């Protein structure tokens, strides 16, 4: 071929690699597999967060029914 | 040569006020290292820095132009430096993002949405992003937003950004004339910019250097002419994110001005946007706001910005000032950057509804014109819905057909005899191989040959195109001696009775397979129509193949006309269990629109084997 | 009953159900009172209304009508007593019970 | 006014509005007794009680 | 066969797109792999929000305090 | 959730001009 006909062979070549692996990243995502994985840890650190904002708010509610009474 | 001929600069040449520190003068720079007039003293002279940029560092290499300009220059020579030496075209849209000159972190989410939007509006109206240049807050996010689109997706973004040449940090690195300088990477300047409209106003580390000539910029640009040439010129959004004290008056200022420059903003960043949000939600009419939320707004003014009583009150009073003009205000609140510059675009325009319809069908975003264009209360000329309904035909927006369907527009008094043939001579859409179908029909009838490229293609040949792909004993609507009476005393009588028939013959010659599954749907002969799609798909895939043409276009026929065979098949299992005798009646009664044959000829004719 | 026809869209969209919703209308305010004009003739009918003209169109998604003509067009007042003894006559039918 | 048969009853076909739906319909007379309507709309109109 | 018959089987096959459409749509909503994305979705925007309510929660808790410090 | 999250800025928004009357 020729120099000219390598760089659009080249860049040609970097179109074909960018969807390769991005469409693979996207058969891996939409996968059942993955889905099912990523539910359950986000479900790990709202359990922590949740339990830490009802312990949060007993203390809120305390605080309001001391305000309260001072008043 | 030419931007050293043209473009001046000023350099600190003065008295050397020492203030406070006596290294220290009026410019901020050191006392040793000198070589507006008012305390400067400052002298005009040729510039000695542009050219190139080469980022080196900071991930993908990138090139980015630049210049220093006096702060004084008048725009029109700036306006002809963008469209005449670095080659770039006319926007249709203009883009202007402030902010906070600190720097911040936002939600992640509220990043990336922001990030996405930004970067798809750029390209899909192709306009030009106006930042402050340097690297430092909302800047520093579009250049993380530039980052992901360097990383992710194909466009050139062009992203011009405004910022004192003063506070750029290596100001040596940057001399040269034509000359690419590399850049490491005061603070530095964002690397994921395009080119560069750095202004000296003589000062070293200090702002308000650029804001003037970036505002007399914009609005040369605003008086320019868009290239449809109906009498408007470009847009302006007005993009917010954060921001401070210097925003609130940015505001006031491009709301009122003549035009109108609509203003953005965002939520979750903080501050001044925040403070927009707390006085749009809580209104009412306007600027009348109650006594409640006036001090609620003065108390969250003077503890997120810790100001005073007064400073507070004369926030509050630009903050009324701007309200003022609320309809030109819209919020983002999470649970974009799109929409925002969409309704700018729309109100910058200030035209007609019909003008807003064509533009959401330039873009191709149904859901913008189902939220703003069709909202309650919106007036409609007569006749310009049926203009839309034929302007989103000729291009393939099923999903504005389907809108405008929904919204009062009907097939039966729409199609005529004369619109469904500048449907069938359209030339915009995707290809299709009915010029070849028409040429051997015309070839055949008279034995001429190749079609004058200015033919007006008849609904006569386009009823001998369907009287050779389907075959045998067939004798089409078209053909028939009333319609061509018709046709020969005209070129409710040119209104078509059964009109989802001809859209379905038009969408399954010109191989739009979209429109035709939206058009089986609507409308009656599904049966028919389904079986009659199968046998035209398969006879212009056998004769894309006879003719040596594409054969992904063959491959594809194939596939449409595999669906509607499966369409038939399962449309023909849905009447069998609903009732037997009446999916019996539906295989044998005759057919009076397809040339007086049956279902069940028409799937034997088909040689559909499943059926 | 704008309402009522918005809520039969999402039924129509999501429920094989026919939903029985004979609405009662004056016949003189309907707009296009000439397109509705035959003896056991399927008429068409146009859903969109000008925002001009004081009269309004029926709504597109009910299923019977019954357009009560007390002689006046564009004036309301001609449907109230007719609904009224309608149902109390129906209430008056006894359930299947 | 004056009394006179109706000329305005059948089925009215909604062109447009998104989905297809057929609604039958007749005009009557503000005066008319409601056991006269109720026969109509059970019988004629094919709708159990 | 007649005018009305045509009106019959033309209503007929009306109720049969409808619902072929209908079932077709009652089947991708009822399938797993729909039901997985739309939850997936749902968790991603709660997980969200929860988070914020929790740095809201943390912040009233702070002024909560305040006003028990104050009275 | 989100008619907690509406609920507890108005609740927020009420303390916040309490505290301002104190």
Not at chain 2, 51 to 59: A, K, L, M, P, S
Not at chain 2, 136 to 165: E, N, Q
Request: hydrophobic residues 40%; contains cysteine.
């Amino acid at each position: 071929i020729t120099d000219d006909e390598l760089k659009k062979v080249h860049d040609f070549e970097e179109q074909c690699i960018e969807e390769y692996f991005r469409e693979k990243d996207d058969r891996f995502n939409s996968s059942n597999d993955e889905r099912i994985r990523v539910t359950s840890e986000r479900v790990e650190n709202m359990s922590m967060r949740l339990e830490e904002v009802n312990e949060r708010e007993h203390s809120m509610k305390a605080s309001l029914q001391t305000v309260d009474i001072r008043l | 040569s030419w931007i050293e001929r043209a473009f001046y600069k000023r350099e600190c040449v003065h008295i050397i006020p020492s203030t406070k520190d006596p290294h220290r003068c009026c410019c901020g720079r050191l006392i040793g290292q000198h070589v507006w007039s008012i305390s400067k003293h400052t002298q005009l002279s040729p510039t000695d820095a542009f050219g190139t940029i080469e980022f080196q560092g900071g991930g993908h290499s990138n090139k980015a132009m630049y210049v220093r300009v006096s702060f004084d220059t008048k725009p029109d020579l700036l306006l002809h430096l963008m469209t005449k030496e670095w080659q770039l075209e006319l926007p249709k849209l203009l883009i202007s993002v402030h902010g906070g000159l600190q720097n911040f972190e936002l939600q992640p989410k509220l990043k990336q949405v922001f990030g996405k939007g930004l970067i798809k509006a750029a390209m899909t109206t192709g306009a030009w992003i106006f930042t402050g240049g340097v690297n430092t807050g909302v800047i520093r996010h579009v250049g993380d937003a530039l980052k992901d689109h360097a990383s992710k997706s194909r466009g050139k973004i062009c992203t011009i950004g405004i910022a004192p040449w003063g506070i750029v940090e290596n100001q040596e690195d940057l001399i040269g004339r034509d000359v690419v300088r590399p850049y490491q990477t005061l603070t530095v300047l964002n690397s994921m910019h395009s080119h560069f409209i750095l202004a000296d106003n003589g000062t070293t580390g200090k702002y308000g250097a650029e804001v003037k000539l970036r505002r007399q910029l914009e609005k040369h640009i605003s008086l320019q002419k868009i290239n449809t040439r109906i009498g408007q010129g470009v847009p302006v959004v007005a993009l917010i994110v954060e921001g401070g004290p210097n925003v609130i008056s940015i505001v006031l200022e491009y709301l009122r001005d003549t035009p109108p420059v609509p203003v953005v903003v965002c939520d979750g960043s903080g501050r001044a946007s925040d403070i927009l949000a707390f006085g749009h939600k809580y209104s009412e009419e306007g600027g009348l706001i109650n006594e409640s939320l006036r001090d609620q707004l003065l108390v969250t003014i003077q503890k997120t910005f810790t100001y005073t009583r007064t400073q507070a009150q004369h926030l509050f009073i630009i903050l009324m000032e701007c309200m003022k003009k609320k309809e030109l205000i819209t919020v983002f609140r999470m649970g974009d950057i799109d929409l925002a510059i969409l309704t700018a675009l729309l109100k910058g325009a200030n035209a007609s509804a019909p003008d807003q319809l064509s533009l959401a069908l330039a873009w191709n975003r149904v859901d913008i014109a189902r939220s703003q264009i069709f909202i309650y209360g919106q007036q409609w000329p007569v006749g310009s819905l049926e203009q839309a309904m034929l302007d989103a035909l000729v291009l393939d927006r099923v999903d504005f057909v389907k809108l405008l369907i929904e919204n009062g527009v009907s097939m039966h008094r729409f199609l005529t005899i004369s619109r469904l043939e500048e449907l069938y001579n359209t030339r915009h859409g995707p290809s299709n191989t009915l010029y070849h179908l028409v040429r051997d029909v015309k070839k055949r009838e008279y034995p001429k040959g190749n079609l004058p490229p200015d033919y007006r293609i008849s609904l006569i040949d386009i009823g001998l195109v369907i009287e050779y792909l389907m075959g045998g004993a067939y004798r089409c609507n078209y053909t028939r001696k009333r319609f061509r009476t018709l046709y020969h005393n005209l070129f409710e009588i040119n209104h078509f009775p059964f009109p989802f028939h001809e859209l379905m013959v038009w969408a399954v010659l010109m191989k739009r397979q979209k429109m035709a599954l939206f058009f089986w749907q609507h409308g009656e002969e599904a049966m028919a129509k389904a079986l009659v799609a199968c046998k035209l798909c398969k006879a212009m895939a056998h004769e894309a193949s006879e003719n040596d043409m594409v054969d992904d276009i063959s491959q594809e026929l194939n596939h449409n006309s595999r669906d509607f065979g499966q369409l038939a098949v399962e449309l023909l299992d849905q009447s069998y269990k609903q009732d037997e005798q009446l999916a019996m009646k539906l295989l044998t009664y005759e057919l009076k629109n397809w040339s007086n044959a049956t279902c069940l000829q028409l799937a034997v004719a088909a040689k559909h084997r499943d059926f | 009953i704008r309402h009522v026809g918005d809520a039969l869209k999402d039924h129509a969209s999501k429920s094989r159900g026919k939903i029985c919703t004979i609405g009662i209308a004056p016949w003189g305010i309907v707009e296009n009172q000439e397109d509705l004009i035959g003896r056991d003739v399927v008429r068409p009918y146009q859903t969109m209304s000008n925002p001009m003209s004081k009269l309004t169109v029926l709504n597109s998604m009910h299923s019977h009508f019954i357009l009560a003509d007390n002689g006046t067009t564009g004036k309301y007042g001609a449907e109230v007593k007719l609904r009224r003894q309608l149902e109390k006559h129906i209430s008056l039918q006894k359930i299947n019970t």
